[PDB]
Each structure stands twice: as structure tokens, then as C-alpha cells.
């Protein structure tokens, strides 16, 4: 009876506690990330925290290059995140082979969401404690942000945020868009979109960042790439000469 809390079957209230507790695990890393769409690019910002001095900072990341055009940032423990990344990469590569064209960001998102739905319905599989944010500049849809969770749910966003202080980032972004009246950052260069992204990250969290406190991924026509400490520093300086 009390096992309706150990495996994924309904509770008398029609709930799935394991999926709920999986959502809880997504915040275990205490990291926040946000993504925004530019005029022709998609940017993703994510806090980077390297506590141990014995760690090689270069190997600590939660952003992944899924395919030449798709990037994915994960909110949740690293092992489940890497499990998700490997699967997504294999899926993206297979799709290209079978259908002759690059897997679209939203399709890969639906596919990963469906796999998640399965862990939600089959008892022997546990949900992954992660939230996946996919980004790219789709050849048909333009800049795109699609996010999936342990419930198998997924949807597209104008912008989005994930993590412990998700709500604050979200309202901040909501406000900016109620003001701008448009669904994207009307900037021609991705560098400025990255700057916007970081600027609002700061405002919302009320914190300052050094070049080693952030992690950035950018998606443009035919390519998704992550920024280096120095590329970021150049970003932080620019925003500094405005405040």
C-alpha cells in the first residue's frame, strides 16, 4: 500500500510521488540557468560553481553540444545529466542517418520527453532527476528553446529559467517582455544578447559575477558553441561600462 511512493504508480490522489521527488532532485546542484532568444541566435546562461580547489574547472560543465546545431543545458545531478546527454546525442545522430536532415530542437525535445514519460509509466525504470533545456536556431522555426522535465512534459519558450531561484528569474524576464511587447531580444549580434542574458541574471539574483562564475552556450544558424572564460570576461566588461 505505502509503496505507491516507491515506484511510479498512482497514489489515491492520482499522484506520482517518484516524479515529484525527481523534480526535487533537479535543484540538488543549486545552480540556476536561463535562456533567451535573439533576433537570429539563442543564448543560454548557467551559473558555474567549482567549490573544490582540487578540481579541474575546465571539466565542470552542465552545458552540452548535442549536435552541430543543438545545445542542451541540464539542471540536476551530473550523472543523470550525462545519461541524458549521451542519449540525446545518439538520438540526434540516428535521426540524421534515417531521415536525411538534422533533428530539429523541438523534435529532439519531444523524443526525450517521451522517453521520460516512459519512466513515469513503467515501474522498473526510475525518472531522471533533471530538467533539460534545448536550444538552437532551427532551419524552419528560427531561434528555439524547448525544455523537458521528469514528468515527460515539454514546451517551447520565448525565454525560460530553471533552478532554485527560477521564479525570480522568470518574473524578471516576464516583466521585460510585458514592456518590450515582442517575444525576443531585438539585437543583431549574439554578443549583445549574451550581455542582456547576463544582465538580467544579475538583476534577478541580485549578484555580481566574475568570469569563472558563469557558463555560456550560444546557438546560431548552423552552429551551437560554448563561450570561454575570456569570451565571457569580454562580455562582463562590456556590461560594466554601462552601469
Amino acid at each position: 500500500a505505502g509503496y505507491d511512493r516507491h515506484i511510479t504508480i498512482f497514489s489515491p490522489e492520482g499522484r506520482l510521488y517518484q516524479v515529484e521527488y525527481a523534480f526535487k532532485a533537479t535543484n540538488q546542484t543549486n545552480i540556476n540557468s536561463l535562456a533567451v532568444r535573439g533576433k537570429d541566435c539563442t543564448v543560454v546562461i548557467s551559473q558555474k560553481k567549482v567549490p573544490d580547489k582540487l578540481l579541474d574547472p575546465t571539466t565542470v560543465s552542465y552545458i552540452f553540444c548535442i549536435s552541430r546545431t543543438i545545445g542542451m543545458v541540464v539542471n540536476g545531478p551530473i550523472p543523470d545529466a550525462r545519461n541524458a546527454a549521451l542519449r540525446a546525442k545518439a538520438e540526434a545522430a540516428e535521426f540524421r542517418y534515417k531521415y536525411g536532415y538534422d533533428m530539429p530542437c523541438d523534435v529532439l525535445a519531444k523524443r526525450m520527453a517521451n522517453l521520460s514519460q516512459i519512466y513515469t509509466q513503467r515501474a522498473y525504470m526510475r525518472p531522471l532527476g533533471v530538467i533539460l533545456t534545448f536550444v538552437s536556431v532551427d532551419e524552419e522555426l528560427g531561434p528555439s528553446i524547448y525544455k523537458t522535465d521528469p514528468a515527460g512534459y515539454y514546451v517551447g519558450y520565448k525565454a525560460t529559467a530553471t533552478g532554485p531561484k527560477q521564479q525570480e528569474i522568470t518574473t524578471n524576464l516576464e516583466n521585460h517582455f510585458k514592456k518590450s511587447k515582442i517575444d525576443h531580444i531585438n539585437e543583431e549580434s549574439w554578443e549583445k544578447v549574451v550581455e542582456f542574458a547576463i544582465t538580467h541574471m544579475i538583476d534577478a539574483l541580485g549578484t555580481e559575477f566574475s568570469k569563472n562564475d558563469l557558463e555560456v552556450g550560444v546557438a546560431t544558424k548552423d552552429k551551437f558553441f560554448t563561450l570561454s572564460a575570456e569570451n565571457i570576461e569580454e562580455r562582463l566588461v562590456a556590461i560594466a561600462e554601462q552601469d
Binding site: 505505502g2 535543484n27 578540481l55 579541474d56 571539466t59 545531478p77 550523472p79 545519461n83
Partner: protein, 244 residues
């Protein structure tokens, strides 16, 4: 309610996997082992408790090689350690067979990572009772890694696990600050012999045997080899000396 810690792949109300956490306990109860990344390679060393005079000296080797360029050492349930290396070896052979080139350390790490992470997905298996320090040299440098029972792993400058991990980490952190330019393979060996002698205090009751191995582009040609004879004694002394 309770009972969330009785089955392996179950999320507790706070989002944890207690069985993995209990596995960690098995690790902390184990012998101490470490790894130090140098300017062109990596060094591995471990504590071998001498249960009695009956144990043939130098015989029960713990450090293991994977392929010809990777070194692996672990703390916890030894048999789980061997199991993981066997997989690592198949994973490496399969990589070389298809791609010809021996497996890059980062790639090798994810292979071990995915496999261990896999043992936290079902209740039909138990998580691995060991933390593993491994690494080597490849196309672009040396790499040091440590993998936890959760499947979590990262690249390290220095790393340690087991009974005296704190002493070790303390010692390792010192070296990091005092050597921003990079330690050398020769130096890392001695430094390693010491960190282990020091970290042995958290088990000072039993006598032990030191074991070291290394993989250096200049000292071993990028191949993993064990430290033996003179070079070994030399590091033993360097340690016995600084332990007083």
C-alpha cells in the same frame, strides 16, 4: 513515510538515493588512495594495510592498468573495483577496435561514468561500493579523474578517497597553491609517497605497504608503469623523512 532507503533506484522525499549514499559509506571505510596530475602525466598511489606478517610483501597488487595508457586505483569493496576495471577494459578494447586509436581519457571516463550511473537506475542491482581514481596520457595531455558510486566524476588536479581522504586533500591542496607552474612526474611520485604516509595516521594502528604507479610522457613514454626498486625506495625514504 519511510523505507525509501531499502530499494536502490528510489528517490526519497528530498530527492536523494539513499542506497548510493550507503555505498559511499563502504568507500569511506576503505583504504586511502590518491592521484596527482603532473606537468606531463599522472601518479597513482595507495595504502595497503598489512593485516599480518603472513601477507606476502609486494604481491597483492591493487593498482590496475586499462589498455596500456590508463591507471586505475580505488577505495571501498575491492571486488567491485575489479568488476569496474574489467568493464573499463572491454570498453577500451571496443573503442580501439573500431577507431584504431587508444581511448582518450575523457572518453574513457564517461564510459566508466555511464556504466556506474546505470547501476543507480534499477532495484535489481546494487550501486558500486568504490570511488575510483584513474587517468593517463593521450593525444592532448594528461588527465586525472575520480568517479563516485553515484556515477558522478570530474577532472582533477589532485584527488583522494578512503579513510584518510581529508589529510590527503589537505596535502594535495597545499601542493596546488605552492605549484601553479606544475609538479613534475619525479616530484609527484615522492609527493605521493608522502601524502599517503601522512594520510596513514587515520589508521596508524595497522602497518602498511606503499604502492605507486605513473604514466608520464617523458618518464614512461605515455605508458602506465609501476614504480619499483630504487625509485620506489627513494620515495619511501622521502616520506619516512618528512613524517618526522
Amino acid at each position: 513515510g519511510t523505507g525509501y532507503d531499502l530499494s536502490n533506484s528510489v528517490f526519497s522525499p528530498d530527492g536523494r538515493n539513499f542506497q548510493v549514499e550507503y555505498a559511499v559509506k563502504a568507500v569511506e571505510n576503505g583504504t586511502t588512495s590518491i592521484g596527482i596530475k603532473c606537468n606531463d602525466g599522472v601518479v597513482f598511489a595507495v595504502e595497503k594495510l598489512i593485516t599480518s606478517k603472513l601477507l606476502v610483501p609486494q604481491k597483492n597488487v591493487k593498482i590496475q592498468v586499462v589498455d596500456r595508457h590508463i591507471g586505475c586505483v580505488y577505495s571501498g569493496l575491492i571486488p567491485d573495483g575489479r568488476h569496474l576495471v574489467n568493464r573499463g577494459r572491454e570498453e577500451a578494447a571496443s573503442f580501439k577496435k573500431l577507431y584504431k586509436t587508444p581511448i582518450p581519457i575523457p572518453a574513457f571516463a564517461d564510459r566508466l561514468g555511464q556504466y556506474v550511473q546505470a547501476h543507480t537506475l534499477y532495484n535489481s542491482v546494487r550501486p558500486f561500493g568504490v570511488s575510483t581514481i584513474f587517468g593517463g596520457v593521450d593525444k592532448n595531455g594528461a588527465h586525472l579523474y575520480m568517479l563516485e558510486p553515484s556515477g558522478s566524476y570530474w577532472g582533477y588536479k589532485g584527488a583522494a578517497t578512503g579513510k584518510g581522504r581529508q589529510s590527503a586533500k589537505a596535502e594535495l591542496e597545499k601542493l596546488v597553491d605552492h605549484h601553479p607552474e606544475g609538479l613534475s612526474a619525479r616530484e609527484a611520485v615522492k609527493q605521493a609517497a608522502k601524502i599517503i604516509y601522512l594520510a596513514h595516521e587515520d589508521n596508524k594502528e595497522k602497518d602498511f605497504e606503499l604502492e605507486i604507479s605513473w604514466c608520464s610522457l617523458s618518464e614512461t613514454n605515455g605508458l602506465h608503469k609501476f614504480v619499483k626498486g630504487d625509485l620506489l625506495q627513494e620515495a619511501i625514504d622521502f616520506a619516512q623523512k618528512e613524517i618526522n
